[PDB]
Symmetry: C5
Subunit: 114 residues, 5 copies
């Protein structure tokens, strides 16, 4: 029943001119993630895990990022850092053509209770 810790939320990239969030991913200790998001948390891609373990494969059942930010704020978490990365993998075995994907994550933290 640990209260403090880090939680990361992110999304992969790739009308029309706006931001496109296909899915909001959640990473951190499972008990922390459950306390914040509750039933809006989809655990199907990593089911039946001990609450004190860590995961990088949860995701949310809604699409707007600011709603996830607000829910983290309601539970005492603060955004401390964020960054965006790019990854390139070859299309097939015998080509130089690649597929590019971006990953943007936001780091949240909650300090120990009083």
């Amino acid at each position: 029943d640990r209260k403090w810790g880090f939680i990361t939320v992110g999304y992969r990239g790739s009308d029309a001119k706006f931001r496109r969030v296909p899915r909001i991913l959640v990473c951190g200790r499972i008990s922390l993630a459950k306390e914040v998001f509750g039933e809006t948390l989809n655990e199907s891609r990593d089911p039946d895990r001990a609450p004190e373990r860590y995961t990088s494969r949860f995701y949310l059942k809604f699409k707007h990022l600011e709603r996830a930010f607000d829910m983290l704020s309601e539970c005492g978490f603060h955004m401390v850092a964020c960054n965006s990365s790019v990854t390139a993998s070859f299309i097939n075995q015998y080509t130089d053509d690649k597929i590019w994907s971006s990953y943007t994550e936001y780091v949240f933290y909650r300090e120990p209770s009083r």
Copy 2:
């Protein structure tokens, strides 16, 4: 309606060397954006929405970013993070040529009222 929450302002990437902002996008809870920007807020790309819901399709009528930063500062928001992401997409269906777009966003936050 609550007063705390997150607000994100951003623009798509690119009188030649200077910064080129074609449009200022606004994301977050709908009631917060209307309270901050008011008559300068354009909702045409997502109209007739409940004030307690979330959007990512509003935009501002002016184009200077620092003005939007100041209006958020008046209402009690503070900038907590910013990031820039790049993303690509194939032009045609039978080609590897791509088009690259850049996106820069600035995250703001306001605490609950006293």
Copy 3:
């Protein structure tokens, strides 16, 4: 008004070091004038009102830390920074592109006490 945001940046591109060709200044004009004074070059956006906003001012020197120090003297703090990259086609019938990068630093001053 004494509070507000000021953004300084430069465009990407004696070989390994950091190459800064020009320091751009963005924000409310009265704030930019108060901070940088006569080091400010207003030729690309002249005869503007002090209460208006600009994104086309630039400085007469090139070392960024000197601009950082001047902002700090007038009560500004650096709150964020980011770097972006953009690409445009070289001509109309080609897929070749030119890549330019941009690094900016965000400063803010709170209202007078």
Copy 4:
């Protein structure tokens, strides 16, 4: 001493983030105090505790667990960044492989 910086990072069933290995950089004595047995020192062994290393790595793969361990010892995350680098495939080609590196910077202030 007790204060100092520590950096953790990584080089980057398919939508999620792939963290192959968590790297640790900083003064050796600080890294051992924070991570202990979970610290793999095989690629840079038998070094003075007051020296600095860039080649330690952890025996687990979840980032937020490393973040939590740093938070237990009094460290705070003060910055994070991601970079990309490209190196030519061979001598007579323009092709190249791209690799990204995400970084998280931690710091603990001197004790009381």
Copy 5:
């Protein structure tokens, strides 16, 4: 005086972090106080102490040691970023060489 900004950085490029050289930018009198004998000034000689440089560099290669020396003198890390820049290989080609640059911004407030 004693306050001011100082930036440290390096140019991009096993499976670890490769720092070829650590660059130091800021007011020259500040850089001397922080890094002292570890500071190499050969690429910007005969400068006035109250002037600014972007061409100093350090004699060691581990970033965290430079981080610790700065915080030991009262400096705090306030921001950091990475950038990528491309240039054409020659005049009649679209082939390009890519380089990355990561920097960390430090600051110290006026004395008491």
